[PDB]
mmCIF file with all atom_site columns, C-alpha atoms and ligand atoms in Angstrom:
data_model
loop_
_atom_site.group_PDB
_atom_site.id
_atom_site.type_symbol
_atom_site.label_atom_id
_atom_site.label_alt_id
_atom_site.label_comp_id
_atom_site.label_asym_id
_atom_site.label_entity_id
_atom_site.label_seq_id
_atom_site.pdbx_PDB_ins_code
_atom_site.Cartn_x
_atom_site.Cartn_y
_atom_site.Cartn_z
_atom_site.occupancy
_atom_site.B_iso_or_equiv
_atom_site.pdbx_formal_charge
_atom_site.auth_seq_id
_atom_site.auth_comp_id
_atom_site.auth_asym_id
_atom_site.auth_atom_id
_atom_site.pdbx_PDB_model_num
ATOM   1   C CA . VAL C 1 1  ? -56.661 -5.804  -40.483 1.00 20.87 ? 1   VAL C CA 1
ATOM   2   C CA . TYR C 1 2  ? -57.463 -9.245  -41.881 1.00 20.73 ? 2   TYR C CA 1
ATOM   3   C CA . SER C 1 3  ? -57.591 -12.951 -40.371 1.00 21.10 ? 3   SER C CA 1
ATOM   4   C CA . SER C 1 4  ? -57.690 -15.912 -43.104 1.00 21.61 ? 4   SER C CA 1
ATOM   5   C CA . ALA C 1 5  ? -54.773 -18.458 -44.438 1.00 23.72 ? 5   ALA C CA 1
ATOM   6   C CA . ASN C 1 6  ? -57.314 -20.084 -46.325 1.00 24.79 ? 6   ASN C CA 1
ATOM   7   C CA . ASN C 1 7  ? -54.883 -23.200 -45.888 1.00 22.77 ? 7   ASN C CA 1
ATOM   8   C CA . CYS C 1 8  ? -52.875 -25.367 -43.739 1.00 21.16 ? 8   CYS C CA 1
ATOM   9   C CA . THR C 1 9  ? -49.751 -27.418 -44.435 1.00 24.04 ? 9   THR C CA 1
ATOM   10  C CA . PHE C 1 10 ? -48.944 -27.974 -40.683 1.00 26.74 ? 10  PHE C CA 1
ATOM   11  C CA . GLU C 1 11 ? -50.454 -27.408 -37.216 1.00 26.27 ? 11  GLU C CA 1
ATOM   12  C CA . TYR C 1 12 ? -48.900 -28.004 -33.608 1.00 28.18 ? 12  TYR C CA 1
ATOM   13  C CA . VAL C 1 13 ? -50.045 -27.316 -30.368 1.00 31.11 ? 13  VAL C CA 1
ATOM   14  C CA . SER C 1 14 ? -48.110 -27.877 -27.172 1.00 31.55 ? 14  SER C CA 1
ATOM   15  C CA . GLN C 1 15 ? -47.422 -26.244 -23.731 1.00 35.67 ? 15  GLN C CA 1
ATOM   16  C CA . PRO C 1 16 ? -46.404 -22.455 -24.017 1.00 39.01 ? 16  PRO C CA 1
ATOM   17  C CA . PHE C 1 17 ? -43.058 -21.888 -24.430 1.00 41.90 ? 17  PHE C CA 1
ATOM   18  C CA . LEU C 1 18 ? -42.752 -18.285 -22.511 1.00 39.12 ? 18  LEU C CA 1
ATOM   19  C CA . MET C 1 19 ? -45.063 -18.645 -19.910 1.00 39.54 ? 19  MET C CA 1
ATOM   20  C CA . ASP C 1 20 ? -43.149 -20.242 -17.423 1.00 40.48 ? 20  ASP C CA 1
ATOM   21  C CA . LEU C 1 21 ? -43.344 -17.930 -14.259 1.00 40.07 ? 21  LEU C CA 1
ATOM   22  C CA . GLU C 1 22 ? -41.898 -18.618 -10.872 1.00 40.71 ? 22  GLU C CA 1
ATOM   23  C CA . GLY C 1 23 ? -39.219 -16.505 -8.212  1.00 43.67 ? 23  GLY C CA 1
ATOM   24  C CA . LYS C 1 24 ? -41.569 -13.453 -8.390  1.00 41.00 ? 24  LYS C CA 1
ATOM   25  C CA . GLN C 1 25 ? -41.231 -10.975 -5.573  1.00 38.70 ? 25  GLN C CA 1
ATOM   26  C CA . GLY C 1 26 ? -37.533 -10.255 -6.610  1.00 37.86 ? 26  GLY C CA 1
ATOM   27  C CA . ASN C 1 27 ? -35.006 -9.577  -8.809  1.00 39.46 ? 27  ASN C CA 1
ATOM   28  C CA . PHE C 1 28 ? -35.303 -12.960 -9.985  1.00 40.67 ? 28  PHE C CA 1
ATOM   29  C CA . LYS C 1 29 ? -36.711 -11.790 -14.022 1.00 38.28 ? 29  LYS C CA 1
ATOM   30  C CA . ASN C 1 30 ? -36.981 -15.545 -16.228 1.00 37.43 ? 30  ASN C CA 1
ATOM   31  C CA . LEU C 1 31 ? -34.339 -14.735 -19.267 1.00 37.29 ? 31  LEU C CA 1
ATOM   32  C CA . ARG C 1 32 ? -35.949 -16.940 -22.004 1.00 37.43 ? 32  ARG C CA 1
ATOM   33  C CA . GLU C 1 33 ? -33.290 -17.860 -24.331 1.00 35.06 ? 33  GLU C CA 1
ATOM   34  C CA . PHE C 1 34 ? -34.334 -19.388 -27.530 1.00 40.24 ? 34  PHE C CA 1
ATOM   35  C CA . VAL C 1 35 ? -32.446 -20.795 -30.526 1.00 40.93 ? 35  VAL C CA 1
ATOM   36  C CA . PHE C 1 36 ? -34.134 -20.676 -33.872 1.00 40.81 ? 36  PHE C CA 1
ATOM   37  C CA . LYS C 1 37 ? -32.634 -23.232 -37.013 1.00 41.49 ? 37  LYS C CA 1
ATOM   38  C CA . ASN C 1 38 ? -33.302 -23.970 -40.188 1.00 42.28 ? 38  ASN C CA 1
ATOM   39  C CA . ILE C 1 39 ? -31.913 -27.127 -41.803 1.00 42.93 ? 39  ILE C CA 1
ATOM   40  C CA . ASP C 1 40 ? -32.668 -29.494 -44.813 1.00 41.30 ? 40  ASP C CA 1
ATOM   41  C CA . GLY C 1 41 ? -36.702 -29.741 -44.104 1.00 43.62 ? 41  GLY C CA 1
ATOM   42  C CA . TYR C 1 42 ? -36.519 -28.922 -40.317 1.00 46.59 ? 42  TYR C CA 1
ATOM   43  C CA . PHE C 1 43 ? -37.355 -25.748 -38.064 1.00 47.24 ? 43  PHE C CA 1
ATOM   44  C CA . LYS C 1 44 ? -35.430 -26.553 -34.452 1.00 46.79 ? 44  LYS C CA 1
ATOM   45  C CA . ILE C 1 45 ? -35.876 -24.814 -31.486 1.00 47.06 ? 45  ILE C CA 1
ATOM   46  C CA . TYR C 1 46 ? -33.973 -24.805 -28.355 1.00 48.36 ? 46  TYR C CA 1
ATOM   47  C CA . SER C 1 47 ? -34.665 -23.220 -25.203 1.00 46.13 ? 47  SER C CA 1
ATOM   48  C CA . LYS C 1 48 ? -33.507 -22.916 -21.084 1.00 44.37 ? 48  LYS C CA 1
ATOM   49  C CA . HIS C 1 49 ? -35.586 -20.319 -19.233 1.00 43.80 ? 49  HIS C CA 1
ATOM   50  C CA . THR C 1 50 ? -33.445 -19.054 -16.196 1.00 46.43 ? 50  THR C CA 1
ATOM   51  C CA . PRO C 1 51 ? -34.057 -16.567 -13.442 1.00 45.24 ? 51  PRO C CA 1
ATOM   52  C CA . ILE C 1 52 ? -31.404 -13.736 -12.940 1.00 45.77 ? 52  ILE C CA 1
ATOM   53  C CA . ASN C 1 53 ? -30.618 -10.841 -10.491 1.00 44.60 ? 53  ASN C CA 1
ATOM   54  C CA . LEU C 1 54 ? -29.574 -7.855  -13.274 1.00 44.28 ? 54  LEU C CA 1
ATOM   55  C CA . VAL C 1 55 ? -31.371 -6.822  -15.821 1.00 46.37 ? 55  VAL C CA 1
ATOM   56  C CA . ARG C 1 56 ? -30.003 -4.546  -17.982 1.00 49.02 ? 56  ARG C CA 1
ATOM   57  C CA . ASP C 1 57 ? -27.536 -7.065  -20.213 1.00 50.22 ? 57  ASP C CA 1
ATOM   58  C CA . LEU C 1 58 ? -26.919 -10.706 -20.282 1.00 48.44 ? 58  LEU C CA 1
ATOM   59  C CA . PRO C 1 59 ? -26.030 -12.801 -16.925 1.00 47.02 ? 59  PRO C CA 1
ATOM   60  C CA . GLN C 1 60 ? -22.865 -13.764 -18.259 1.00 48.10 ? 60  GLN C CA 1
ATOM   61  C CA . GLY C 1 61 ? -22.949 -17.369 -16.819 1.00 45.92 ? 61  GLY C CA 1
ATOM   62  C CA . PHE C 1 62 ? -23.114 -20.656 -18.524 1.00 47.54 ? 62  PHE C CA 1
ATOM   63  C CA . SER C 1 63 ? -25.993 -23.086 -19.439 1.00 44.45 ? 63  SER C CA 1
ATOM   64  C CA . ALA C 1 64 ? -26.722 -24.979 -22.623 1.00 43.95 ? 64  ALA C CA 1
ATOM   65  C CA . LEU C 1 65 ? -30.474 -25.178 -23.879 1.00 41.31 ? 65  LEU C CA 1
ATOM   66  C CA . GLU C 1 66 ? -32.223 -28.271 -24.671 1.00 39.50 ? 66  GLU C CA 1
ATOM   67  C CA . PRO C 1 67 ? -34.832 -29.191 -27.661 1.00 40.00 ? 67  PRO C CA 1
ATOM   68  C CA . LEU C 1 68 ? -37.572 -27.869 -27.691 1.00 42.81 ? 68  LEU C CA 1
ATOM   69  C CA . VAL C 1 69 ? -39.666 -28.641 -30.823 1.00 44.55 ? 69  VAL C CA 1
ATOM   70  C CA . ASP C 1 70 ? -38.459 -30.116 -34.309 1.00 44.65 ? 70  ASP C CA 1
ATOM   71  C CA . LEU C 1 71 ? -41.286 -29.659 -37.186 1.00 45.85 ? 71  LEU C CA 1
ATOM   72  C CA . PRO C 1 72 ? -40.484 -31.617 -40.414 1.00 45.55 ? 72  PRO C CA 1
ATOM   73  C CA . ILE C 1 73 ? -41.372 -28.034 -42.426 1.00 43.57 ? 73  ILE C CA 1
ATOM   74  C CA . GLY C 1 74 ? -40.203 -27.549 -45.645 1.00 43.12 ? 74  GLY C CA 1
ATOM   75  C CA . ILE C 1 75 ? -40.347 -23.719 -45.950 1.00 42.15 ? 75  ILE C CA 1
ATOM   76  C CA . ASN C 1 76 ? -38.561 -20.724 -46.926 1.00 43.91 ? 76  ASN C CA 1
ATOM   77  C CA . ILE C 1 77 ? -36.949 -18.763 -43.788 1.00 46.09 ? 77  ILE C CA 1
ATOM   78  C CA . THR C 1 78 ? -35.294 -15.760 -44.767 1.00 48.59 ? 78  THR C CA 1
ATOM   79  C CA . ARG C 1 79 ? -36.986 -12.915 -42.538 1.00 44.43 ? 79  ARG C CA 1
ATOM   80  C CA . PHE C 1 80 ? -38.317 -12.942 -38.860 1.00 44.69 ? 80  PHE C CA 1
ATOM   81  C CA . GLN C 1 81 ? -40.353 -10.961 -36.789 1.00 42.93 ? 81  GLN C CA 1
ATOM   82  C CA . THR C 1 82 ? -40.682 -10.664 -33.481 1.00 43.17 ? 82  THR C CA 1
ATOM   83  C CA . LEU C 1 83 ? -44.474 -10.055 -32.170 1.00 40.96 ? 83  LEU C CA 1
ATOM   84  C CA . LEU C 1 84 ? -45.231 -7.812  -28.966 1.00 40.22 ? 84  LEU C CA 1
ATOM   85  C CA . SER C 1 85 ? -40.209 0.148   -18.903 1.00 38.23 ? 85  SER C CA 1
ATOM   86  C CA . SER C 1 86 ? -39.786 -2.117  -22.277 1.00 39.50 ? 86  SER C CA 1
ATOM   87  C CA . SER C 1 87 ? -36.854 -4.082  -21.549 1.00 39.96 ? 87  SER C CA 1
ATOM   88  C CA . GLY C 1 88 ? -37.505 -5.445  -25.249 1.00 42.32 ? 88  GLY C CA 1
ATOM   89  C CA . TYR C 1 89 ? -34.833 -8.513  -26.686 1.00 41.74 ? 89  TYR C CA 1
ATOM   90  C CA . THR Z 2 1  ? -5.886  -71.328 -35.885 1.00 38.83 ? 1   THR Z CA 1
ATOM   91  C CA . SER Z 2 2  ? -9.261  -69.305 -35.557 1.00 40.59 ? 2   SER Z CA 1
ATOM   92  C CA . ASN Z 2 3  ? -11.632 -66.968 -34.414 1.00 40.43 ? 3   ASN Z CA 1
ATOM   93  C CA . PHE Z 2 4  ? -15.070 -67.475 -32.373 1.00 42.92 ? 4   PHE Z CA 1
ATOM   94  C CA . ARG Z 2 5  ? -17.868 -65.435 -32.287 1.00 44.82 ? 5   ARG Z CA 1
ATOM   95  C CA . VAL Z 2 6  ? -21.701 -65.425 -30.453 1.00 46.51 ? 6   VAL Z CA 1
ATOM   96  C CA . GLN Z 2 7  ? -24.287 -65.379 -32.751 1.00 43.27 ? 7   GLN Z CA 1
ATOM   97  C CA . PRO Z 2 8  ? -27.665 -63.531 -32.457 1.00 39.05 ? 8   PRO Z CA 1
ATOM   98  C CA . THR Z 2 9  ? -30.639 -65.370 -31.756 1.00 39.23 ? 9   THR Z CA 1
ATOM   99  C CA . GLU Z 2 10 ? -34.052 -63.066 -31.624 1.00 33.05 ? 10  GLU Z CA 1
ATOM   100 C CA . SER Z 2 11 ? -34.085 -59.994 -33.254 1.00 36.34 ? 11  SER Z CA 1
ATOM   101 C CA . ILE Z 2 12 ? -35.859 -56.433 -31.669 1.00 32.39 ? 12  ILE Z CA 1
ATOM   102 C CA . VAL Z 2 13 ? -37.642 -53.458 -33.315 1.00 30.89 ? 13  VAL Z CA 1
ATOM   103 C CA . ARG Z 2 14 ? -38.908 -51.352 -31.321 1.00 30.03 ? 14  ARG Z CA 1
ATOM   104 C CA . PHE Z 2 15 ? -40.772 -48.145 -32.502 1.00 26.26 ? 15  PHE Z CA 1
ATOM   105 C CA . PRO Z 2 16 ? -42.386 -45.198 -29.640 1.00 25.57 ? 16  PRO Z CA 1
ATOM   106 C CA . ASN Z 2 17 ? -45.864 -45.862 -30.818 1.00 25.73 ? 17  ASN Z CA 1
ATOM   107 C CA . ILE Z 2 18 ? -48.502 -45.416 -33.119 1.00 27.95 ? 18  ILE Z CA 1
ATOM   108 C CA . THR Z 2 19 ? -50.345 -42.082 -32.929 1.00 30.36 ? 19  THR Z CA 1
ATOM   109 C CA . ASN Z 2 20 ? -51.768 -39.625 -35.283 1.00 30.76 ? 20  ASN Z CA 1
ATOM   110 C CA . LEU Z 2 21 ? -53.350 -42.665 -37.368 1.00 29.06 ? 21  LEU Z CA 1
ATOM   111 C CA . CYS Z 2 22 ? -55.090 -41.516 -40.287 1.00 30.95 ? 22  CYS Z CA 1
ATOM   112 C CA . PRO Z 2 23 ? -58.605 -41.731 -40.047 1.00 35.94 ? 23  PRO Z CA 1
ATOM   113 C CA . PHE Z 2 24 ? -59.661 -41.456 -43.836 1.00 40.00 ? 24  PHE Z CA 1
ATOM   114 C CA . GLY Z 2 25 ? -63.107 -41.483 -42.371 1.00 38.86 ? 25  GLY Z CA 1
ATOM   115 C CA . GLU Z 2 26 ? -63.329 -38.028 -44.667 1.00 37.67 ? 26  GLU Z CA 1
ATOM   116 C CA . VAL Z 2 27 ? -63.357 -40.001 -47.597 1.00 36.02 ? 27  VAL Z CA 1
ATOM   117 C CA . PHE Z 2 28 ? -64.289 -43.390 -46.848 1.00 36.68 ? 28  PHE Z CA 1
ATOM   118 C CA . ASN Z 2 29 ? -67.177 -42.943 -44.534 1.00 40.01 ? 29  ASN Z CA 1
ATOM   119 C CA . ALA Z 2 30 ? -68.041 -39.438 -44.771 1.00 35.59 ? 30  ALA Z CA 1
ATOM   120 C CA . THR Z 2 31 ? -72.137 -40.022 -46.100 1.00 34.40 ? 31  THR Z CA 1
ATOM   121 C CA . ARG Z 2 32 ? -72.092 -36.524 -48.404 1.00 34.64 ? 32  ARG Z CA 1
ATOM   122 C CA . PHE Z 2 33 ? -70.175 -37.551 -51.444 1.00 36.83 ? 33  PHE Z CA 1
ATOM   123 C CA . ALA Z 2 34 ? -69.367 -34.574 -53.969 1.00 33.31 ? 34  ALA Z CA 1
ATOM   124 C CA . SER Z 2 35 ? -70.423 -35.664 -57.529 1.00 36.13 ? 35  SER Z CA 1
ATOM   125 C CA . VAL Z 2 36 ? -67.187 -35.438 -60.389 1.00 36.47 ? 36  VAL Z CA 1
ATOM   126 C CA . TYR Z 2 37 ? -68.712 -31.480 -61.325 1.00 36.86 ? 37  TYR Z CA 1
ATOM   127 C CA . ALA Z 2 38 ? -66.915 -30.911 -57.602 1.00 38.20 ? 38  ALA Z CA 1
ATOM   128 C CA . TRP Z 2 39 ? -65.001 -33.881 -56.436 1.00 38.41 ? 39  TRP Z CA 1
ATOM   129 C CA . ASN Z 2 40 ? -63.636 -33.187 -53.172 1.00 37.37 ? 40  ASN Z CA 1
ATOM   130 C CA . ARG Z 2 41 ? -59.849 -33.170 -51.898 1.00 36.96 ? 41  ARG Z CA 1
ATOM   131 C CA . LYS Z 2 42 ? -58.769 -33.882 -47.922 1.00 34.11 ? 42  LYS Z CA 1
ATOM   132 C CA . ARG Z 2 43 ? -55.193 -33.437 -47.470 1.00 37.38 ? 43  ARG Z CA 1
ATOM   133 C CA . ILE Z 2 44 ? -53.562 -36.085 -45.186 1.00 35.78 ? 44  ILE Z CA 1
ATOM   134 C CA . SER Z 2 45 ? -49.980 -35.307 -43.648 1.00 34.80 ? 45  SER Z CA 1
ATOM   135 C CA . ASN Z 2 46 ? -48.359 -35.467 -39.933 1.00 34.85 ? 46  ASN Z CA 1
ATOM   136 C CA . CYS Z 2 47 ? -50.157 -39.099 -39.304 1.00 34.24 ? 47  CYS Z CA 1
ATOM   137 C CA . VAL Z 2 48 ? -49.551 -42.912 -39.756 1.00 36.27 ? 48  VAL Z CA 1
ATOM   138 C CA . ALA Z 2 49 ? -51.396 -44.463 -43.137 1.00 36.35 ? 49  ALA Z CA 1
ATOM   139 C CA . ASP Z 2 50 ? -52.434 -47.606 -42.234 1.00 36.69 ? 50  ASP Z CA 1
ATOM   140 C CA . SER S 3 1  ? -52.607 -39.825 -54.781 1.00 36.12 ? 1   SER S CA 1
ATOM   141 C CA . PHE S 3 2  ? -48.992 -39.944 -53.300 1.00 34.85 ? 2   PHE S CA 1
ATOM   142 C CA . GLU S 3 3  ? -45.763 -37.598 -53.649 1.00 38.24 ? 3   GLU S CA 1
ATOM   143 C CA . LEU S 3 4  ? -42.470 -37.861 -53.142 1.00 39.41 ? 4   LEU S CA 1
ATOM   144 C CA . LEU S 3 5  ? -40.543 -34.480 -53.338 1.00 39.93 ? 5   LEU S CA 1
ATOM   145 C CA . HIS S 3 6  ? -37.475 -33.434 -51.265 1.00 38.81 ? 6   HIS S CA 1
ATOM   146 C CA . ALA S 3 7  ? -39.139 -32.357 -48.063 1.00 38.63 ? 7   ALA S CA 1
ATOM   147 C CA . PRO S 3 8  ? -39.058 -34.781 -45.221 1.00 39.70 ? 8   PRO S CA 1
ATOM   148 C CA . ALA S 3 9  ? -42.407 -37.513 -45.468 1.00 39.26 ? 9   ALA S CA 1
ATOM   149 C CA . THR S 3 10 ? -45.061 -36.924 -42.727 1.00 40.48 ? 10  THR S CA 1
ATOM   150 C CA . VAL S 3 11 ? -46.954 -39.719 -44.056 1.00 38.15 ? 11  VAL S CA 1
ATOM   151 C CA . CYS S 3 12 ? -46.161 -42.996 -43.024 1.00 39.67 ? 12  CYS S CA 1
ATOM   152 C CA . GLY S 3 13 ? -47.017 -46.560 -42.301 1.00 39.69 ? 13  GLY S CA 1
ATOM   153 C CA . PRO S 3 14 ? -47.154 -48.074 -38.784 1.00 42.18 ? 14  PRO S CA 1
ATOM   154 C CA . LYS S 3 15 ? -43.796 -49.087 -37.577 1.00 41.24 ? 15  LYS S CA 1
ATOM   155 C CA . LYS S 3 16 ? -44.100 -52.739 -36.105 1.00 38.76 ? 16  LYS S CA 1
ATOM   156 C CA . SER S 3 17 ? -42.626 -53.475 -33.016 1.00 42.38 ? 17  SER S CA 1
ATOM   157 C CA . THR S 3 18 ? -40.996 -56.267 -31.485 1.00 42.83 ? 18  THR S CA 1
ATOM   158 C CA . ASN S 3 19 ? -41.367 -57.492 -27.324 1.00 41.02 ? 19  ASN S CA 1
ATOM   159 C CA . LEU S 3 20 ? -37.850 -56.678 -25.732 1.00 40.93 ? 20  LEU S CA 1
ATOM   160 C CA . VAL S 3 21 ? -35.147 -59.330 -25.106 1.00 39.97 ? 21  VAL S CA 1
ATOM   161 C CA . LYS S 3 22 ? -32.588 -58.949 -22.735 1.00 39.65 ? 22  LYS S CA 1
ATOM   162 C CA . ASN S 3 23 ? -29.715 -60.856 -21.126 1.00 41.22 ? 23  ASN S CA 1
ATOM   163 C CA . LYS S 3 24 ? -28.919 -62.395 -24.667 1.00 42.75 ? 24  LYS S CA 1
ATOM   164 C CA . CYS S 3 25 ? -27.574 -61.706 -27.943 1.00 47.77 ? 25  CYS S CA 1
ATOM   165 C CA . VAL S 3 26 ? -29.368 -60.572 -30.238 1.00 47.23 ? 26  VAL S CA 1
ATOM   166 C CA . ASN S 3 27 ? -29.764 -58.446 -33.550 1.00 48.35 ? 27  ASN S CA 1
ATOM   167 C CA . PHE S 3 28 ? -31.781 -54.672 -33.040 1.00 49.19 ? 28  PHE S CA 1
ATOM   168 C CA . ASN S 3 29 ? -33.213 -51.802 -34.003 1.00 44.25 ? 29  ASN S CA 1
ATOM   169 C CA . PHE S 3 30 ? -34.202 -49.024 -31.847 1.00 41.38 ? 30  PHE S CA 1
ATOM   170 C CA . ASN S 3 31 ? -36.081 -46.013 -33.442 1.00 37.60 ? 31  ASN S CA 1
ATOM   171 C CA . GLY S 3 32 ? -34.050 -46.514 -36.764 1.00 34.66 ? 32  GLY S CA 1
ATOM   172 C CA . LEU S 3 33 ? -30.858 -47.277 -34.573 1.00 36.78 ? 33  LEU S CA 1
ATOM   173 C CA . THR S 3 34 ? -29.654 -50.805 -35.784 1.00 39.25 ? 34  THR S CA 1
ATOM   174 C CA . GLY S 3 35 ? -26.992 -53.021 -34.509 1.00 39.57 ? 35  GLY S CA 1
ATOM   175 C CA . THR S 3 36 ? -25.525 -56.162 -32.454 1.00 40.69 ? 36  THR S CA 1
ATOM   176 C CA . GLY S 3 37 ? -25.048 -57.326 -29.021 1.00 41.09 ? 37  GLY S CA 1
ATOM   177 C CA . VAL S 3 38 ? -26.630 -57.987 -25.185 1.00 39.76 ? 38  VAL S CA 1
ATOM   178 C CA . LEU S 3 39 ? -28.945 -55.663 -23.406 1.00 39.74 ? 39  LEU S CA 1
ATOM   179 C CA . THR S 3 40 ? -28.973 -55.077 -20.104 1.00 36.97 ? 40  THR S CA 1
ATOM   180 C CA . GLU S 3 41 ? -30.375 -52.811 -17.758 1.00 38.53 ? 41  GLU S CA 1
ATOM   181 C CA . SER S 3 42 ? -28.580 -49.407 -17.407 1.00 39.83 ? 42  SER S CA 1
ATOM   182 C CA . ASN S 3 43 ? -27.244 -47.242 -14.196 1.00 41.08 ? 43  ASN S CA 1
ATOM   183 C CA . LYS S 3 44 ? -27.156 -43.965 -16.578 1.00 37.78 ? 44  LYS S CA 1
ATOM   184 C CA . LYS S 3 45 ? -29.520 -41.011 -16.283 1.00 36.73 ? 45  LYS S CA 1
ATOM   185 C CA . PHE S 3 46 ? -30.223 -39.915 -19.741 1.00 38.41 ? 46  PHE S CA 1
ATOM   186 C CA . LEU S 3 47 ? -31.388 -36.578 -20.026 1.00 39.70 ? 47  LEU S CA 1
ATOM   187 C CA . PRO S 3 48 ? -35.439 -36.382 -21.145 1.00 40.91 ? 48  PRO S CA 1
ATOM   188 C CA . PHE S 3 49 ? -34.703 -35.707 -24.772 1.00 37.98 ? 49  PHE S CA 1
ATOM   189 C CA . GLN S 3 50 ? -31.726 -37.903 -25.176 1.00 38.64 ? 50  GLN S CA 1
HETATM 190 C C1 . NAG V 4 .  ? -57.263 -20.176 -51.870 1.00 39.19 ? 101 NAG V C1 1
HETATM 191 C C2 . NAG V 4 .  ? -55.628 -20.312 -52.125 1.00 39.19 ? 101 NAG V C2 1
HETATM 192 O O1 . NAG V 4 .  ? -54.461 -19.326 -51.694 1.00 39.19 ? 101 NAG V O1 1
HETATM 193 N N1 . NAG V 4 .  ? -55.601 -21.200 -52.064 1.00 39.19 ? 101 NAG V N1 1
HETATM 194 C C3 . NAG V 4 .  ? -53.816 -22.036 -52.299 1.00 39.19 ? 101 NAG V C3 1
HETATM 195 C C4 . NAG V 4 .  ? -53.959 -21.922 -54.015 1.00 39.19 ? 101 NAG V C4 1
HETATM 196 O O2 . NAG V 4 .  ? -54.023 -21.174 -54.811 1.00 39.19 ? 101 NAG V O2 1
HETATM 197 C C5 . NAG V 4 .  ? -52.232 -23.008 -53.841 1.00 39.19 ? 101 NAG V C5 1
HETATM 198 O O3 . NAG V 4 .  ? -51.850 -23.032 -55.568 1.00 39.19 ? 101 NAG V O3 1
HETATM 199 C C6 . NAG V 4 .  ? -52.200 -23.894 -53.386 1.00 39.19 ? 101 NAG V C6 1
HETATM 200 C C7 . NAG V 4 .  ? -50.785 -24.263 -53.192 1.00 39.19 ? 101 NAG V C7 1
HETATM 201 O O4 . NAG V 4 .  ? -50.391 -25.566 -52.401 1.00 39.19 ? 101 NAG V O4 1
HETATM 202 O O5 . NAG V 4 .  ? -52.429 -23.836 -51.769 1.00 39.19 ? 101 NAG V O5 1
HETATM 203 C C8 . NAG V 4 .  ? -53.925 -23.253 -51.613 1.00 39.19 ? 101 NAG V C8 1
HETATM 204 O O6 . NAG V 4 .  ? -54.265 -23.118 -50.305 1.00 39.19 ? 101 NAG V O6 1
HETATM 205 C C1 . NAG V 4 .  ? -65.546 -46.682 -44.322 1.00 37.04 ? 102 NAG V C1 1
HETATM 206 C C2 . NAG V 4 .  ? -65.285 -47.065 -42.651 1.00 37.04 ? 102 NAG V C2 1
HETATM 207 O O1 . NAG V 4 .  ? -64.871 -46.454 -41.821 1.00 37.04 ? 102 NAG V O1 1
HETATM 208 N N1 . NAG V 4 .  ? -66.116 -47.951 -42.745 1.00 37.04 ? 102 NAG V N1 1
HETATM 209 C C3 . NAG V 4 .  ? -66.150 -48.830 -41.232 1.00 37.04 ? 102 NAG V C3 1
HETATM 210 C C4 . NAG V 4 .  ? -64.821 -49.932 -41.302 1.00 37.04 ? 102 NAG V C4 1
HETATM 211 O O2 . NAG V 4 .  ? -63.597 -49.476 -41.657 1.00 37.04 ? 102 NAG V O2 1
HETATM 212 C C5 . NAG V 4 .  ? -65.141 -50.570 -39.818 1.00 37.04 ? 102 NAG V C5 1
HETATM 213 O O3 . NAG V 4 .  ? -64.166 -51.524 -40.543 1.00 37.04 ? 102 NAG V O3 1
HETATM 214 C C6 . NAG V 4 .  ? -66.532 -51.398 -39.744 1.00 37.04 ? 102 NAG V C6 1
HETATM 215 C C7 . NAG V 4 .  ? -66.452 -52.100 -38.460 1.00 37.04 ? 102 NAG V C7 1
HETATM 216 O O4 . NAG V 4 .  ? -65.600 -52.918 -38.594 1.00 37.04 ? 102 NAG V O4 1
HETATM 217 O O5 . NAG V 4 .  ? -67.076 -50.054 -39.751 1.00 37.04 ? 102 NAG V O5 1
HETATM 218 C C8 . NAG V 4 .  ? -67.233 -49.211 -40.951 1.00 37.04 ? 102 NAG V C8 1
HETATM 219 O O6 . NAG V 4 .  ? -68.605 -48.309 -40.941 1.00 37.04 ? 102 NAG V O6 1
HETATM 220 C C1 . NAG V 4 .  ? -36.575 -19.920 -51.589 1.00 37.25 ? 103 NAG V C1 1
HETATM 221 O O1 . NAG V 4 .  ? -35.720 -21.515 -51.512 1.00 37.25 ? 103 NAG V O1 1
HETATM 222 C C2 . NAG V 4 .  ? -35.137 -21.405 -52.966 1.00 37.25 ? 103 NAG V C2 1
HETATM 223 C C3 . NAG V 4 .  ? -34.276 -22.947 -52.743 1.00 37.25 ? 103 NAG V C3 1
HETATM 224 O O2 . NAG V 4 .  ? -35.260 -23.663 -51.670 1.00 37.25 ? 103 NAG V O2 1
HETATM 225 C C4 . NAG V 4 .  ? -34.081 -20.047 -52.936 1.00 37.25 ? 103 NAG V C4 1
HETATM 226 O O3 . NAG V 4 .  ? -33.690 -20.852 -54.587 1.00 37.25 ? 103 NAG V O3 1
HETATM 227 C C5 . NAG V 4 .  ? -35.067 -19.186 -53.351 1.00 37.25 ? 103 NAG V C5 1
HETATM 228 O O4 . NAG V 4 .  ? -34.191 -18.099 -53.816 1.00 37.25 ? 103 NAG V O4 1
HETATM 229 C C6 . NAG V 4 .  ? -35.394 -18.744 -52.097 1.00 37.25 ? 103 NAG V C6 1
HETATM 230 N N1 . NAG V 4 .  ? -36.342 -17.121 -52.283 1.00 37.25 ? 103 NAG V N1 1
HETATM 231 C C7 . NAG V 4 .  ? -36.343 -16.308 -51.475 1.00 37.25 ? 103 NAG V C7 1
HETATM 232 C C8 . NAG V 4 .  ? -36.779 -15.337 -51.633 1.00 37.25 ? 103 NAG V C8 1
HETATM 233 O O5 . NAG V 4 .  ? -35.253 -16.324 -50.907 1.00 37.25 ? 103 NAG V O5 1
#
């Protein structure tokens, strides 16, 4: 409906987080785990991106997520929204 | 009777690089300066200010 | 106009660096991590974010 901020506190541009596509033509769907943290003055994101054969629930395997970004953004994060047959999240 | 320790000679200071260097051209080089009735404000962030 | 509030600083001066001295007892500061000792080539394989 609207499309203007009239502002900019901080801006960052890099490689896409979600568009890591490999292992097609099979049951290997890319499970994209993310962890979002809000600490004193920083917003951290961790991720992995692992192909799995079972798509219904979490794979029950084990791996750790690696640091993706660390942004010096001093804002109040209290709520969040995800923007988007229908596997969902 | 005593202890000894090898002392340091030089010192090493290492930082990644100098990136996102702040231009400041927008305030010192720009030709279209506003007058006092409508002076301009430029915000500086995420940069190295030399 | 400069301000200090509580948020992490995003504007800073350049961080001057020196050369790298190996196989000698030196003082050092690597990206904020200080200490003393002798630096040698490592056979350790750090992950890209470590
Ligand atoms: C058009 C507009 O909303 N401008 C806002 C201003 O009202 C606010 O006081 C200031 C605080 O930093 O941030 C600006 O982006
Ligand atoms: C405001 C501004 O940027 N003035 C630049 C100065 O910084 C630069 O050092 C010089 C060339 O040496 O050329 C001037 O036009
Ligand atoms: C905004 O943050 C301050 C402290 O950072 C907190 O006291 C306040 O309750 C927060 N506002 C909301 C709506 O949560």
